[PDB]
Design goal:
This protein is α/β, with parallel strands linked by helices and 261 residues long. Helices cover 54% and strands 9% of the residues. It has one domain (1-261): 3-Layer(aba) Sandwich (Collagenase (Catalytic Domain)), CATH 3.40.390. The chain has helices spanning 7-25, 49-71, 73-78, 121-143, 150-153, 168-171, 185-198, 201-234, 238-250, and strands at 28-30, 83-88, 97-102, 105-112. A four-stranded mixed beta sheet has the order 1-2-4-3, covered by helices on one side. The PDB classes it as structural genomics, unknown function.
């Protein structure tokens, strides 16, 4: 098959990963199955090499370079995971990621296969980027705590257990951008940040519509506070970062996805 990689191709990709992930960001990006150790399901399939190359370039273009463009290299490094693993999967139906620890920080595993439509922005965000931005935001919060007043905004409406039994139409009027944002304040602020960065305008507005007269002002207040936090603590303009991410994810088909160098 025209899908198996030679040793030369794999060493060329290793070289590219050293130069584009390890050196600038201290991220270990792993695609070789022999170096990955995890639990598995009957969905496990061999990790597709040329698809791993495409994803390494898409991930760098749409997250790592976006963060660099708006916040600088130091910001990007401050919330980066330590390890990214790609593992092959037969479909998207058993979930598309897991999270763990490695070398003292975050490990992100992405499950992939050619069921992926790489240029479909809604699907890439749904499977991968939304959760990623959420976790990066959480690392930011650990290093520089967010304002304690955020927690008061929706005090009384959190469900730390049982969050999953409330749908969007129920939680939005209470000022929660997703059901999961309604669990605990620390998840709420990570969700506001991740939704704001990844939702196209129409999707964000739809949440505001479902929020109605009660919830809109609550979401507005949370978002203003997040914007202010990203500005004061990280010198990042969050609206600009949202726009830069959108510009970049629309540029995917302009990337040179069929070659390593």
């Amino acid at each position: 098959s025209i899908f198996d990689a030679s040793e030369k191709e794999k060493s060329e990709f290793d070289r590219w990963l050293l130069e584009n992930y390890v050196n600038p960001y201290n991220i270990d990006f792993k695609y070789r199955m022999e170096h990955i150790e995890s639990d598995y399901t009957h969905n496990l399939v061999p990790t597709d090499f040329w698809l791993s190359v495409k994803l390494a370039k898409i991930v760098k273009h749409c997250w790592l370079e976006a963060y660099d463009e708006v916040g600088g290299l130091d910001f990007t490094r401050a919330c980066a995971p330590k390890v990214i693993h790609l593992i092959g999967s037969a479909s998207w139906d058993k979930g598309t990621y897991t999270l763990g620890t490695a070398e003292g920080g975050l490990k992100v595993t992405l499950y992939m296969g050619n069921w992926l439509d790489l240029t479909n922005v809604d699907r890439m965000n749904e499977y991968y980027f939304k959760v990623m931005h959420h976790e990066f935001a959480h690392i930011l919060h650990q290093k520089k705590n967010y304002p304690v007043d955020y927690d008061k905004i929706s005090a009384g409406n959190y469900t730390p257990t049982g969050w999953q039994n409330r749908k969007l139409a129920e939680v939005a009027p209470l000022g929660f951008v997703t059901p999961y944002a309604g669990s605990k304040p620390s998840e709420d602020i990570a969700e506001v940040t991740a939704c704001f960065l990844t939702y196209p305008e129409a999707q964000w507005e739809n949440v505001m519509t479902l929020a109605g007269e009660k919830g809109k002002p609550i979401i507005d207040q949370k978002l203003a506070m997040v914007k202010k936090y990203m500005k004061d603590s990280w010198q990042v303009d969050l609206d600009l970062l949202r726009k830069v991410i959108a510009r970049r994810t629309n540029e995917i088909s302009e990337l040179d996805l069929d070659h390593i160098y």
